[PDB]
């Protein structure tokens, strides 16, 4: 109905009162729906903003549950799901919106609440409700860049956008260029990874992944998704694999983990963001900051570093022991199948953790510690730095160090699992004899990258700015389109089903030696995974880069287990060319199959919002475990149903248009 | 003429282009005066903003000197006079405006430049030109709070002012309350001094003092004001005396100096300001930050901490030696008269310094070091913290530590001067027999303080905001009006002229005994200094608090000296004990013929050293105030009572 489209108007101009009129519509709000500030002059307002509006949306006055808890958080405050207190507030609001039976009462509850609660919080609470109600399905939620550009853009632009919108008439407005490589100069070698850390795309993917797989609320409210623990492990694990790749393409070494929390953090990061909702800026972190015990009475944080250390010590113990203990006292075994999934819920701390109290909230609490080094006891009345918000966490270099450490803990479990036997990863009959890649106007087995400007309308997000269009020009990494061509022989006499699994890693190390398996297995980034039907004899399989099941289209972002930006699919490489091993495996789909019916949807990649995850094999399956005896490098790890290919990744420092 | 009033329109809405129309007027700018962005759509603009304007100001197209250097500083960048490079840019722009023939070209040069150079820089360069130009005298420059509220107000208000101005019609707009005590909670005991550090008044006084008495290379005529070195010493010295007073009224100890620069700085400060011109916020400083060697290639700063330490070591040496050495190699003696004045120019590094190269730029460079602890090599592309701008420097607690240190160095010279002899501070014939104070509805010898909201129109400063009024409500310390009553006997047979010098200090120490002189002399804050004619026999002198020569009225500081509402320390609810002191000196000796306090435009009207009775050590035998006194002086126990209530302005 219309109602579905009318809720989307709530996302429009989050800080402009709801009675000011969104898009080509305006709400006809009751007077008991007006805020205390504006209620005493309600007559003057409804009339004043009624003009220039095509439609007028009525709103029925209903009960509305107690909104004390939702309103506890200040309006000009920041909102993060990592902070214990905010979790209880959001989970309560989510509960209200979720608990409105009708799509009409949801509209009424929303319209009332919207101008009383924290915009960032409202956006989250609504987003979660809409995505996981039955009546509001297939609903295309506006990009959070468009509603909250302050979390994605250098603060400098805002006073330019205000100038441009006030001075120049619509239609003649110049696109505002968004600064790139702006957080640090060349004295900081970390500044080279701007195109990854600070890319709009990857930050959106991270935010959205945490939307669809929360770790707190209600198991029926989306917490208990199939293998979300393993997902949490793998997704984040692939972030670092991809990061480590991009590091090698900028003459840097692999990211060093956060060994121990008492030693200083070498790499500081000033993010250059200004929250228009908090009206403040995000604090920076200085070089050689040290983690400090937190006492944030307001936020309900009373945590010592030793608490974190204690959780880690215990988790390590469990992993080595090979089992965990639940609240009840029973033992649950970290087996080949569900081990990783369990560990994930334990480490992140999802209410699915079999004993939160013992093994703690290790990952999340780490994010808070790292974000509050500048003001840990709240004496300076400062908010958390960028690592304290999922929306912005990936911008900071320390993210990759903390997430690197966490990964090592997971690894400690994976190296206990028994090696995949020759048998287990052979497909009797099937043989892959070669794989190549071809780009238009470029040699075989060669990928190209470059810079590319794209445009985004930030108009809906610019509160109290003269209406009209406000286009911003993002510069971001892009790759030339390509396609894989895979030669597979059947030699069986029957149609064989198979999973095509495509990963890509560096060929050599940082020192220039052909990489060993033990090393290289952890640097393989998934590139595609799709089902294929093979006829007897010979089969030529062709697959486009844009068909990738790891990726989501351009259109979705601007307009894994969840959608990685398409333009970030290929590592940057070097101008002189960066050598890389392309790997493909065809596994026996009959074993890997997960009997299930789905057409799929994602964040709103096929989707996988349907109960189960469509692959019985472990995530990162060929390379998640150690090598079997005798294996030493990729070229002797291979079975017949696998193939390797030398690829060369060439960057070109030029800015192509979008066409 | 009109021209004088037309320049004042440049101060209106600094970031709104000059062709958008200021007040009830608009400028008719040439097309070669437009900016490159807006030039190609000139046809659409001049017409679009021509409407709703009563007057239209024409502007003649002139040659215009090269504006390369002025334009070198980015538009979205911060501007500080402490940074070496900015000094050279501003001094060059000042030079351009200053060099324009008529006030028809001053207006033309200005109108062109305004939208090409950094607003903060423009404001400074213009302010300086107008204040010291030939045709432009007695011109009332708009308060810098009204043009740049971002340097004086929590950033939180800005999005409220934008909301209020867009939603609510004029006339029905609610005044925006400005948050007070907002930079730190009660876990930080320093937060108590918000009413002084963060008070609009005192921050304006500091900014303005540096306007009228620069040290900047600039030109020697502008910088060389009578005894500006001693002024620099005394004014800043009184800031800390007053600060130390306010500390005692908040159950704190005296401010500790910055002993040595290698040790951490305990007190951090996040100022909560957001520069709308830079579109960023000012960085904070964390607890236990350490000073670090600066390498800001862009700003032209290559200074090591050891450089600073070397300057200090040398300055100390000179002070103890008793003389300095000029560039030429000659020796100049730090005598009783001009010693302090010299030292001032040496320490701040004013171009008047007899040897900048040797004794350095000690005070100023310190401000930069302290403001860049968070990003000293520019690797993080961050700007300076609050201590890097005179406009905001007093907000940070470290200001008082750094300025406390500097004062100790001056003191090291003052303790070398010979004690004032009984003779030197006696007035033969004159005897002061008593001084008292009286407030309406309050016992004798009792001062009261409290909080008071006042209103300021920040409308001129709110760029790209719907036109109308935008009143902001400041909460600030205030004192009940009072008056001194002084009983003076002549016993001479002739009319005697005299200077009345009134200071106030704390009465007792940490242990609850009468403070000793050595201690107390440094805590005396000047309260008034005025000329009086005494008839033979007995004289009853009466002086109102609002007549103070240390102070200037409310009206000036909201539209220059020390804010009037800050004249009296806060005191305690239970009452704070204080010694009120008055001295009558022989005006004939003190006279400086001639046809106040810190800022006097003319030569300084007092031959005596600034601080006079207490600048030097005690003569032998003297031990406390009550035996320092001569007949022509008087002491009085005063009690300062605070009341935590908010009175209106009426
Ligand atoms: Cu995450
Ligand atoms: Cu994380
Ligand atoms: Cu100063
Ligand atoms: Cu200073």
């Amino acid at each position: 109905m219309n109602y579905k489209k009318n809720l989307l108007l709530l996302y429009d101009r989050p800080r402009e009162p709801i009675f000011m009129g969104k898009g080509k519509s305006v709400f006809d709000v009751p007077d008991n729906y007006l805020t205390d500030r504006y209620r005493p002059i309600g007559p003057e307002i409804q009339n004043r903003f009624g003009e220039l509006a095509e439609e007028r949306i009525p709103v029925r006055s209903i009960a509305l549950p107690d909104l004390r808890i939702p309103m506890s958080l200040g309006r000009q405050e920041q909102f993060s799901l990592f902070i214990p207190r905010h979790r209880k507030i959001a989970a309560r609001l989510i509960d209200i919106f979720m608990g409105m039976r009708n799509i009409e009462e949801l509209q009424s509850c929303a319209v009332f609440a919207r101008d009383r609660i924290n915009p960032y919080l409202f956006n989250y609470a609504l987003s979660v409700a809409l995505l996981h109600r039955r009546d509001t399905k297939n609903l295309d939620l506006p990009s959070v860049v468009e509603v909250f550009p302050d979390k994605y853009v250098d603060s400098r632009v805002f006073e330019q956008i205000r100038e441009e919108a006030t001075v120049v008439p619509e239609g003649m407005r110049m696109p505002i260029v968004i600064p790139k490589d702006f957080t640090a100069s060349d004295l900081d070698e970390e500044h080279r990874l701007w195109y990854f850390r600070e890319d709009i795309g990857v930050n959106l993917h991270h935010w959205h992944w945490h939307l669809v797989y929360p770790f707190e609320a209600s198991n029926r409210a989306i917490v208990d998704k199939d293998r979300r623990g393993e997902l949490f492990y793998y997704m984040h694990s692939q972030l670092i694999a991809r990061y480590n790749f991009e590091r090698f393409c900028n003459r840097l070494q692999r990211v060093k983990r956060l060994n121990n929390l008492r030693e200083p953090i070498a790499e500081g990061y000033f993010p250059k963001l200004d929250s228009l909702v908090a009206s403040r800026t995000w604090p920076g972190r200085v070089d050689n900051a040290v983690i400090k015990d937190l006492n944030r009475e307001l936020d309900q944080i009373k945590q010592d570093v030793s608490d974190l250390e204690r959780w880690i010590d215990r988790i390590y113990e469990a992993v080595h022991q090979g089992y965990v203990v639940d609240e009840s006292g029973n033992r649950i075994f970290l087996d080949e199948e569900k081990g990783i999934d369990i560990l994930g819920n334990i480490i992140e701390s999802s209410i699915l953790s079999p004993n939160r109290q013992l093994y703690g909230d290790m990952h999340n609490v780490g994010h808070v510690f790292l974000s509050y080094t500048h003001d840990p006891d709240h004496r300076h009345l400062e908010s958390f730095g960028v690592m304290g918000d999922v929306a912005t966490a990936m911008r900071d270099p320390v993210f990759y160090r903390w997430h690197s450490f966490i990964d090592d803990i997971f690894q400690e479990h994976k190296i206990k699992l028994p090696a995949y036997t020759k048998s287990q990863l052979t497909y009797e009959g099937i043989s892959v004899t070669g794989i190549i890649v071809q780009s238009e106007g470029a040699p075989v087995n060669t990928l190209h990258t470059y810079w590319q400007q794209s445009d985004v309308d930030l108009s809906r997000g610019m509160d109290f700015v003269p209406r009209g269009n406000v286009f911003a020009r993002f510069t971001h990494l892009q790759h030339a389109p390509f396609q894989y061509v895979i030669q597979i022989d059947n030699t069986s006499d029957a149609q064989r089903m198979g999973f095509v699994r495509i990963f890509m890693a560096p060929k050599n190390d940082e020192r220039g030696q052909p990489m060993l398996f033990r090393d290289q297995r952890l640097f393989m980034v998934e590139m595609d995974k799709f089902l294929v039907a093979l006829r007897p004899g010979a089969n030529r399989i062709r697959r486009r880069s844009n068909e990738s099941t790891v990726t989501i289209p351009f259109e979705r972002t601007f307009r894994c287990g969840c959608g990685w930006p398409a333009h970030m699919l290929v590592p940057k490489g070097l101008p002189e060319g960066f050598p890389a091993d392309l790997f493909v495996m065809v596994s026996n789909y009959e074993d890997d199959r997960v009997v299930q019916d789905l057409v799929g949807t994602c964040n709103d990649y096929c989707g996988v919002r349907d109960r189960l995850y469509p692959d019985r094999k472990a995530m990162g399956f060929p390379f998640d475990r150690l090598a079997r005896t005798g294996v030493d490098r990729l070229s002797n790890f291979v079975t017949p149903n696998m193939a390797i290919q030398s690829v060369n990744v060439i960057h070109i420092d030029k800015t192509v248009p979008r066409t």
Side-chain angles (χ1 to χ4, degrees), chain A:
Chain A
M1 217 208 299
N2 303 50
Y3 283 111
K4 295 186 74 188
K5 262 188 175 157
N6 300 133
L7 296 164
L8 299 187
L9 287 180
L10 301 164
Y11 287 84
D12 198 298
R13 262 137 194 261
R15 287 184 294 116
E16 284 188 4
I18 192 161
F19 58 64
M20 275 187 67
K22 316 287 155 201
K24 273 201 181 172
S25 312
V26 68
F27 291 82
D28 198 21
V29 305
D31 299 6
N32 63 309
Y33 275 38
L34 256 42
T35 51
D36 278 31
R37 177 334 189 193
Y38 286 127
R39 163 138 32 78
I41 64 178
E44 295 83 317
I45 276 164
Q46 179 193 176
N47 211 245
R48 185 206 202 293
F49 295 106
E51 49 174 313
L52 296 98
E54 274 185 7
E55 199 174 11
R56 286 210 65 163
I57 306 149
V59 41
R60 184 171 69 101
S61 180
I62 217 224
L64 299 352
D66 191 10
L67 255 36
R68 187 258 114 67
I69 294 87
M71 283 188 235
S72 73
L73 209 209
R75 277 212 99 209
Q76 294 203 279
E77 283 280 316
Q78 191 67 239
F79 169 78
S80 167
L81 304 136
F82 284 137
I83 289 180
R85 165 179 185 235
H86 294 350
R87 279 137 64 165
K88 271 127 227 157
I89 296 177
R92 160 85 188 118
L93 212 213
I94 292 186
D95 222 14
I96 293 165
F97 289 171
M98 210 59 158
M100 307 284 99
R101 350 71 255 292
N102 201 339
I103 213 180
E104 187 260 41
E105 299 188 13
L106 169 58
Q107 202 207 248
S108 193
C109 189
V111 163
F112 173 79
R114 187 198 183 252
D115 292 3
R116 295 176 159 69
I117 76 176
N118 184 273
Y120 291 132
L121 162 63
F122 181 96
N123 182 81
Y124 175 77
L126 224 203
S127 298
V128 180
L130 300 184
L131 278 179
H132 299 110
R133 286 165 64 98
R134 293 216 289 115
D135 42 350
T136 69
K137 192 51 45 57
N138 312 139
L139 188 46
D140 212 2
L141 267 45
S143 195
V144 64
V145 174
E146 295 179 357
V147 313
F148 289 128
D150 47 290
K151 291 183 163 169
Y152 294 96
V153 149
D154 180 344
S155 70
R156 264 173 167 187
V157 311
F158 281 116
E159 282 304 312
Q160 300 171 10
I161 288 163
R162 232 181 280 279
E163 186 194 357
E164 191 74 6
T166 298
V167 173
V168 180
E170 288 159 283
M172 276 177 271
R173 249 105 89 159
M174 292 267 68
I176 310 303
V177 324
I178 303 304
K180 84 281 151 58
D181 190 26
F182 69 104
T183 56
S185 78
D186 317 63
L187 302 175
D188 194 2
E189 69 198 6
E190 292 297 339
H191 92 308
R192 295 175 209 164
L193 280 278
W194 66 268
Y195 67 83
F196 184 104
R197 290 189 290 92
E198 286 158 22
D199 172 65
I200 297 296
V202 341
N203 270 113
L204 281 171
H205 162 250
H206 193 231
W207 163 263
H208 274 100
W209 189 95
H210 286 285
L211 265 171
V212 343
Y213 302 98
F215 59 83
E216 216 154 295
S218 145
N219 310 33
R220 46 140 65 137
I222 321 132
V223 172
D224 191 3
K225 265 52 214 309
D226 182 57
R227 296 213 279 160
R228 74 157 301 294
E230 188 173 2
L231 222 324
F232 172 87
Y233 151 57
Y234 184 71
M235 194 278 287
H236 285 100
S237 168
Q238 283 285 303
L239 289 174
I240 299 149
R242 277 185 178 283
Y243 183 70
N244 278 316
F245 212 131
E246 303 286 2
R247 289 192 82 72
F248 301 157
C249 302
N250 291 263
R251 295 148 9 239
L252 294 167
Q253 322 300 136
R254 90 195 49 184
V255 69
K256 273 138 207 173
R257 50 209 275 290
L258 271 195
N259 293 112
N260 75 118
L261 302 172
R262 305 291 189 174
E263 298 314 268
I265 312 176
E267 326 82 7
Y269 183 73
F270 294 79
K272 307 285 192 295
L273 306 181
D274 193 318
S275 173
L276 293 165
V277 176
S279 210
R280 299 209 195 294
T281 48
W282 271 263
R285 191 185 56 253
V286 290
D287 294 339
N288 299 311
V290 271
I291 301 180
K292 300 267 196 178
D293 293 8
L294 300 170
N295 189 262
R296 308 274 295 174
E297 201 224 294
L298 208 314
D299 299 308
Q300 298 172 20
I301 299 157
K302 166 88 171 149
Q303 209 89 247
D304 314 318
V305 169
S306 47
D307 288 338
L308 221 185
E309 288 179 340
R310 206 172 303 113
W311 292 338
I312 292 158
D313 276 340
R314 291 175 193 164
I315 284 167
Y316 265 103
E317 211 204 65
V319 166
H320 291 134
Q321 279 174 352
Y323 58 80
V324 302
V325 174
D326 68 351
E327 284 147 7
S328 313
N330 314 138
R331 295 188 180 175
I332 307 175
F333 280 68
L334 305 181
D335 62 19
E336 299 173 15
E337 195 192 57
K338 278 181 167 194
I340 192 67
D341 177 50
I342 293 157
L343 207 51
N345 291 312
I346 302 199
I347 298 215
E348 157 163 62
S349 168
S350 74
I351 58 176
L352 306 192
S353 178
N355 194 355
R356 284 257 262 193
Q357 190 83 7
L358 176 62
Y359 299 116
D361 189 21
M362 176 259 183
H363 158 261
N364 296 340
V365 162
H367 274 268
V368 174
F369 270 114
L370 289 161
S371 72
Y372 271 135
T373 55
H374 64 281
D375 181 39
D377 57 346
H378 197 41
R379 74 165 48 226
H380 295 308
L381 300 170
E382 281 285 323
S383 179
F384 50 76
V386 123
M387 266 287 291
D389 196 321
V390 178
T392 55
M394 290 195 59
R395 290 167 165 281
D396 190 309
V398 82
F399 174 93
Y400 303 90
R401 301 200 58 204
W402 179 235
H403 267 290
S404 192
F405 178 73
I406 291 167
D407 208 62
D408 204 349
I409 291 179
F410 283 124
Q411 294 312 323
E412 203 73 61
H413 171 261
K414 289 286 202 177
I415 62 163
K416 291 180 68 76
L417 300 185
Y420 291 132
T421 70
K422 207 171 196 286
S423 164
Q424 279 174 311
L425 27 67
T426 270
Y427 197 171
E428 209 72 69
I430 302 294
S431 158
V432 184
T433 61
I435 177 162
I436 58 158
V437 299
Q438 302 178 129
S439 309
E440 187 169 41
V444 65
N445 295 346
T446 286
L447 303 167
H448 289 264
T449 63
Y450 47 80
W451 311 123
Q452 160 181 316
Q453 285 170 122
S454 293
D455 293 304
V456 179
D457 193 22
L458 305 181
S459 218
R460 60 167 82 253
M462 291 306 175
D463 306 282
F464 314 115
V465 166
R467 271 295 202 177
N469 283 13
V470 175
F471 290 110
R473 264 212 220 303
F474 290 109
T475 301
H476 58 88
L477 181 75
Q478 179 60 266
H479 63 91
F482 66 100
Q483 44 146 246
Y484 314 94
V485 185
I486 317 166
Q487 312 180 122
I488 312 170
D489 295 351
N490 198 326
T491 91
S492 75
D493 289 304
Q495 158 157 310
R496 285 282 160 285
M497 247 43 192
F499 253 132
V500 187
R501 301 167 184 284
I502 308 175
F503 297 83
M504 200 202 312
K507 196 210 182 57
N508 322 325
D509 56 354
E510 319 109 286
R511 306 177 299 140
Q513 315 302 313
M515 212 161 202
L516 298 177
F517 191 77
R518 13 161 281 224
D519 291 343
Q520 197 193 20
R521 85 177 176 79
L522 303 180
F523 290 106
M524 280 283 174
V525 325
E526 194 180 340
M527 298 297 294
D528 218 323
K529 186 219 298 177
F530 60 94
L531 180 52
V532 78
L534 310 174
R535 76 182 55 263
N539 302 247
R540 210 96 320 179
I541 314 308
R542 187 261 286 111
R543 185 79 175 179
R544 286 172 277 114
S545 63
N546 60 355
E547 288 173 294
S548 182
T549 47
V550 161
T551 234
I552 62 166
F554 258 44
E555 288 208 61
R556 210 283 130 232
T557 288
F558 304 133
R559 247 322 236 69
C560 271
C562 207
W564 182 251
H567 59 105
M568 295 298 302
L569 171 64
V570 185
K572 195 194 75 171
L574 302 163
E576 59 264 36
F578 183 88
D581 282 306
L582 175 55
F583 168 95
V584 53
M585 181 203 192
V586 186
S587 55
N588 186 346
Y589 173 68
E590 203 211 296
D591 295 290
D592 308 352
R593 176 199 301 159
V594 188
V595 35
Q596 191 189 354
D597 155 55
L598 64 316
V599 90
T601 32
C602 76
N603 41 200
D604 278 9
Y605 217 139
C606 48
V608 301
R609 275 320 94 71
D610 271 62
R611 54 181 286 85
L612 270 288
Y613 176 98
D615 192 348
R616 288 214 325 103
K617 288 281 149 52
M619 299 176 204
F621 148 59
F623 319 96
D624 63 334
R625 290 185 202 182
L626 286 187
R628 62 184 181 281
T629 326
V631 169
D632 127 305
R633 64 197 67 252
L634 188 56
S635 63
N636 65 47
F637 167 79
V638 152
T639 58
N641 57 304
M642 300 164 187
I644 310 166
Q645 187 53 252
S646 297
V647 174
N648 186 61
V649 186
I650 301 165
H651 184 244
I652 315 159
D653 183 2
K654 65 182 184 194
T655 302
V656 184
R658 234 177 81 51
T659 94

